Amino acid sequence: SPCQKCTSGCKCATKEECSKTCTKPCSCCPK
Ligand SMILES: [Cd+2]
Ligand SMILES: [Cd+2]
Ligand SMILES: [Cd+2]
Numbered sequence: 001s002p003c004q005k006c007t008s009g010c011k012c013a014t015k016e017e018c019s020k021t022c023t024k025p026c027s028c029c030p031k
Contacts, residue, residue, distance in 0.1 A: 002022075
C-alpha cells in the first residue's frame, strides 16, 4: 500500500529514491 505521495506520484524509479520517501515497495514502487 502506497503512502500519501505515491498514488498518482510514485516518484521512486530505483530503491535509492524509494528507500528515501518510503520504507518498502508500496503497491507501486519496484517489485
Ligand atoms: Cd511510497
Ligand atoms: Cd516508494
Ligand atoms: Cd510507490
